[PDB]
Symmetry: none
Subunit: 214 residues, 2 copies
């Protein structure tokens, strides 16, 4: 099976959250992880991780610290989301200059092996379609335009293996990949999502864009 | 004090929820309540209630059934969300045929004629700005355009009384309205939210649109 993208960037956001019934607050990203997956070798050639300091609700709840495993001192040393997006773009620009990566849906010219097509992968459409999207609009921040299209890996998992998975853990378990300890979060969840994408590629799944916000 | 809107429609959604240690992002509406408040008389002239059958997670968790008071058989008898908006629009169309209500944007003056201005009121922006909005966008359903602007009663309470309320119950307690027992849910919570809005009108608060999409 021939893949369209030479690299995927897998992202699994962690954010503030509460489950106190009908009290509803505004959620802010607290961890911004990304792993660069090589669709030809299967390895992780580069990683990005930044803890984001919340501004509207800077105190992490016990439910949130229990769910994400993130301690208070980590978001206290972290940077606001605005600075985080600048750091992430610097990382994107770095991996472009190193691996000759562009973000395109296809080359309308004969293929040149020097250029590499890359795409963003998330588990659900929640990361780049809900979490980062509706937070940038509410804080009037500039969202990088290359995060407006991605690959919903859960939807890709459903139509490929022809079954409905019960979360990222359930999907990994059904294909024989079992991890130990608590459910991964942040950079660990991103690495495991990239493992699932690599397993799907080995099984012959061609990763295609599933959602666009344009 | 002269009010801008002649009627308010108060909405307090109930939705699926879990507390099983896992990450949960998409919630589905399971109760669709709405009360029509008369801002001049103080009465509730009409009500709407529909139990919505969830599709992505049709089995209500025990944490959800306990928190909302909704039993599994009620959403089993309920209708999908798509059908629910059609019933809600028929109810909107019905109160239009009876009370001559219109929904208009950028209203800088109370109506002085036969036509009556109405607006939607919810506690916080979560109901019409997060819950219904994301669920319609992910399910590719057509959301009624008149649900694109509303009155955040929590924000209106904060800037009017100049104090931080501890939830809808905390807000009611601070204005002398005290309830006992479990936290209300669904249609009961909508009536209690409309009670708060009526008292705020009595204190002189002019209800204004706070959010528009």
């Amino acid at each position: 099976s021939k893949q369209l993208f030479d690299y995927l960037i897998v992202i699994d956001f962690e954010s503030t959250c509460w489950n106190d019934g009908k009290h509803h607050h505004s959620q802010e990203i607290i961890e911004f992880p990304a792993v660069l997956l090589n669709t030809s070798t299967g390895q992780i050639d580069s990683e990005f991780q930044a803890y984001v300091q919340p501004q509207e609700h800077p105190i992490l709840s016990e439910f949130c610290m229990e769910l994400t495993g993130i301690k208070q001192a980590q978001v206290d040393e972290g940077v606001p989301l605005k600075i985080c997006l600048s750091q992430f773009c610097k990382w994107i620009h770095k991996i472009q200059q190193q691996k000759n990566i562009i973000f395109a849906t296809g080359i309308s010219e004969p293929s040149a092996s020097e250029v590499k097509l890359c795409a963003f992968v998330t588990w659900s459409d929640w990361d780049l379609g809900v979490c980062l999207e509706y937070e940038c609009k509410r804080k009037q921040l500039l969202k990088p335009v290359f995060l407006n299209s991605w690959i919903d890996l859960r939807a890709t998992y459903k139509l490929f293996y022809r079954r409905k998975p019960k979360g990222l853990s359930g999907a990994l378990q059904e294909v024989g990949i079992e991890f130990s300890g608590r459910e991964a979060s942040g950079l660990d969840a991103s690495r495991n999502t990239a493992l699932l994408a690599w397993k799907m590629i080995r099984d012959g799944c061609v990763m295609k864009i599933t959602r666009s916000l344009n």
